Structures are given as structure tokens and as C-alpha cells.
Design a protein around this motif. Structure first.
Motif, PDB file in Angstrom:
ATOM      1  N   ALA A   1       0.803  -1.210   0.000  1.00  0.00           N
ATOM      2  CA  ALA A   1       0.000   0.000   0.000  1.00  0.00           C
ATOM      3  C   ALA A   1       0.837   1.262   0.000  1.00  0.00           C
ATOM      4  O   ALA A   1       1.956   1.303   0.523  1.00  0.00           O
ATOM      5  N   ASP A   2       0.214   2.298  -0.567  1.00  0.00           N
ATOM      6  CA  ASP A   2       0.585   3.714  -0.437  1.00  0.00           C
ATOM      7  C   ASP A   2      -0.762   4.420  -0.563  1.00  0.00           C
ATOM      8  O   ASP A   2      -1.400   4.261  -1.606  1.00  0.00           O
ATOM      9  N   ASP A   3      -1.272   5.104   0.479  1.00  0.00           N
ATOM     10  CA  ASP A   3      -0.674   5.371   1.779  1.00  0.00           C
ATOM     11  C   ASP A   3      -1.075   4.283   2.782  1.00  0.00           C
ATOM     12  O   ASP A   3      -0.700   3.126   2.576  1.00  0.00           O
ATOM     13  N   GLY A   4      -1.806   4.616   3.854  1.00  0.00           N
ATOM     14  CA  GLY A   4      -2.125   3.651   4.887  1.00  0.00           C
ATOM     15  C   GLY A   4      -3.488   3.001   4.718  1.00  0.00           C
ATOM     16  O   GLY A   4      -4.188   3.177   3.717  1.00  0.00           O
TER      17      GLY A   4
ATOM     18  N   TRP B   1      -6.306   5.063   2.013  1.00  0.00           N
ATOM     19  CA  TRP B   1      -6.321   6.414   1.470  1.00  0.00           C
ATOM     20  C   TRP B   1      -4.988   6.739   0.798  1.00  0.00           C
ATOM     21  O   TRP B   1      -3.960   6.070   0.999  1.00  0.00           O
ATOM     22  N   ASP B   2      -5.042   7.819   0.016  1.00  0.00           N
ATOM     23  CA  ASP B   2      -3.898   8.472  -0.614  1.00  0.00           C
ATOM     24  C   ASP B   2      -3.876   9.931  -0.163  1.00  0.00           C
ATOM     25  O   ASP B   2      -4.841  10.683  -0.384  1.00  0.00           O
ATOM     26  N   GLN B   3      -2.761  10.336   0.451  1.00  0.00           N
ATOM     27  CA  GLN B   3      -2.547  11.733   0.804  1.00  0.00           C
ATOM     28  C   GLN B   3      -2.046  12.562  -0.371  1.00  0.00           C
ATOM     29  O   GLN B   3      -1.945  13.796  -0.258  1.00  0.00           O
ATOM     30  N   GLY B   4      -1.699  11.903  -1.471  1.00  0.00           N
ATOM     31  CA  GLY B   4      -1.112  12.542  -2.621  1.00  0.00           C
ATOM     32  C   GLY B   4       0.036  11.726  -3.177  1.00  0.00           C
ATOM     33  O   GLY B   4       0.615  10.882  -2.472  1.00  0.00           O
ATOM     34  N   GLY B   5       0.373  11.971  -4.431  1.00  0.00           N
ATOM     35  CA  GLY B   5       1.513  11.320  -5.059  1.00  0.00           C
ATOM     36  C   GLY B   5       1.138   9.974  -5.640  1.00  0.00           C
ATOM     37  O   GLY B   5       0.177   9.865  -6.405  1.00  0.00           O
ATOM     38  N   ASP B   6       1.912   8.950  -5.291  1.00  0.00           N
ATOM     39  CA  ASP B   6       1.634   7.604  -5.762  1.00  0.00           C
ATOM     40  C   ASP B   6       0.553   6.947  -4.899  1.00  0.00           C
ATOM     41  O   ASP B   6       0.222   7.401  -3.798  1.00  0.00           O
ATOM     42  N   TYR B   7      -0.010   5.853  -5.414  1.00  0.00           N
ATOM     43  CA  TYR B   7      -1.104   5.164  -4.734  1.00  0.00           C
ATOM     44  C   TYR B   7      -1.141   3.708  -5.205  1.00  0.00           C
ATOM     45  O   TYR B   7      -0.983   3.424  -6.397  1.00  0.00           O
TER      46      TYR B   7
HETATM   47 CA   LIG Z   1       0.413   8.579  -1.766  1.00  0.00          CA
END
Ligand SMILES: [Ca+2]
Ligand SMILES: OC[C@@H](O)[C@H]1O[C@@H](O)[C@H](O)[C@@H]1O
Ligand SMILES: [Ca+2]
Ligand SMILES: [Ca+2]
Ligand SMILES: [Ca+2]
Ligand SMILES: [Ca+2]
Ligand SMILES: [Ca+2]
Length: 182
Positions: A100-103, A145-151
Motif C-alpha cells: 500500500a501507499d498510503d495507509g 487512502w492516498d494523501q497525494g503522489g503515488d497510490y
Molecule cells: Ca500517496
């Protein structure tokens, strides 16, 4: 009536505030109606870049499951998914291994079984084992979730002590706990 399908009930939420942890994503879920709903029938999503909540990145991330989106959400900086339903598991011992990316947080029968309570670039965690007491459809929910960037989000499960792992998909998922024939 809730639809019976071989998958989890999926909700997508976007926001322009920062998601740092599980509690932030749960607060987003509780703050409004979902920005889109979908059927989560093949829970192996991404990898992609340039923010899950932007453009058509959610569609790309969800892949096969995106054809069940209720709408195409507009842009946000941050976003994530809440999945809920049932998974058929025989009694025995299991463990998750999640990329995963993010948590994320996964619970079964109300008990957390795989948790990363922070942001991270793509990483794979082999989680501690848990037991299932009685064979059948077990309640399951997931947050990612994704905070931004990659996922990316791929939570695999082993029934054989980590020798083999499988993706949760239409073979064993049920939206209501009844047996799907779809
Ligand atoms: Ca991310
Ligand atoms: O917080 C760790 C860090 O690498 C974050 O930036 C990103 O681009 C990545 O997807 C992750 O969300
Ligand atoms: Ca809500
Ligand atoms: Ca969009
Ligand atoms: Ca895919
Ligand atoms: Ca599809
Ligand atoms: Ca952010």
C-alpha cells in the motif's frame, strides 16, 4: 433492499484537506455522503501516480471495478475508499500481507487484522496471524487512502501460514452475506 453481488460495498471520498492517518479518513467518511459508490469485486488496485483523487486516476486505480462507479468524482487533492461486506473463510488461521501507499485498516468481525496508521510510499507488510472460529461469511471492512503522489492497495490473504496468498475477489466476497450467483 441492498444489492447482492460478489464483492464489497465500495465508497470513495475525496477532500482538499490532508489525510495523515486512519482517524482523518474516518472523519472524512463521517462528514458527508460518498463522492462515488462502486462494487469492490477484485481488491487489487493501482499502482499509479499524480494523486488518486485527480482526473481519471481513481478509474485507473480501481481497474475492473471502475465500471461500477456511480459517478466520476471531480478533482480533490486527497482521497480514499471505505469497503464493507462479507468474505467467505473456513475456520482456521490466516494472515494478511498488504502492499500500500498510503495507509489502511482492515477489520474482520469487528477486530483489526491489518493496520498502517500513517502515510508511506509503497511498502508491503506481512501482518500477524488471526483466527476464524466458525466457517462461513465473515464481516469485513477496509479503509485505504492516498494523501497525494503515488497510490496502490493490494491486501492479500494466506490460509497456509504464508506459503501462498490470494487477492480477495468475487470467488469469496459477498455484499450482504448471502451466497452470490452472479
Ligand atoms: Ca500517496
Ligand atoms: O509520506 C510518504 C511519501 O512518500 C508520500 O508522498 C508520495 O508521493 C507518496 O505516494 C506518499 O504518499
Ligand atoms: Ca458518509
Ligand atoms: Ca475524476
Ligand atoms: Ca488493475
Ligand atoms: Ca468491470
Ligand atoms: Ca495531501
Amino acid at each position: 433492499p441492498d444489492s447482492l453481488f460478489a464483492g464489497l460495498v465500495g465508497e470513495y471520498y475525496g477532500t482538499n484537506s490532508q489525510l495523515n492517518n486512519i482517524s482523518d479518513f474516518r472523519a472524512l467518511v463521517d462528514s458527508k455522503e460518498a463522492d462515488a459508490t462502486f462494487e469492490a469485486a477484485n481488491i487489487s488496485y493501482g499502482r499509479g501516480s499524480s494523486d488518486v483523487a485527480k482526473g481519471t486516476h481513481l478509474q485507473e486505480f480501481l481497474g475492473s471495478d471502475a465500471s461500477t462507479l456511480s459517478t466520476d468524482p471531480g478533482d480533490n487533492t486527497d482521497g480514499g475508499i471505505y469497503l464493507q461486506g462479507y468474505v467467505y473463510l473456513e475456520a482456521g488461521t490466516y494472515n494478511f500481507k498488504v502492499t500500500a501507499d498510503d495507509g489502511y485498516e482492515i477489520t474482520i468481525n469487528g477486530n483489526p487484522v491489518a493496520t498502517v496508521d500513517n502515510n508511506q510510499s509503497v511498502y508491503t507488510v506481512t501482518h500477524a496471524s488471526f483466527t476464524i472460529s466458525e466457517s462461513g461469511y465473515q464481516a469485513i471492512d477496509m479503509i485505504w487512502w492516498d494523501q497525494g503522489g503515488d497510490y496502490v492497495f493490494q491486501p492479500t490473504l494466506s490460509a497456509d501460514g504464508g506459503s501462498t496468498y490470494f487477492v480477495l475477489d468475487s470467488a469469496i466476497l459477498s455484499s450482504t452475506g448471502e451466497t452470490p450467483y452472479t
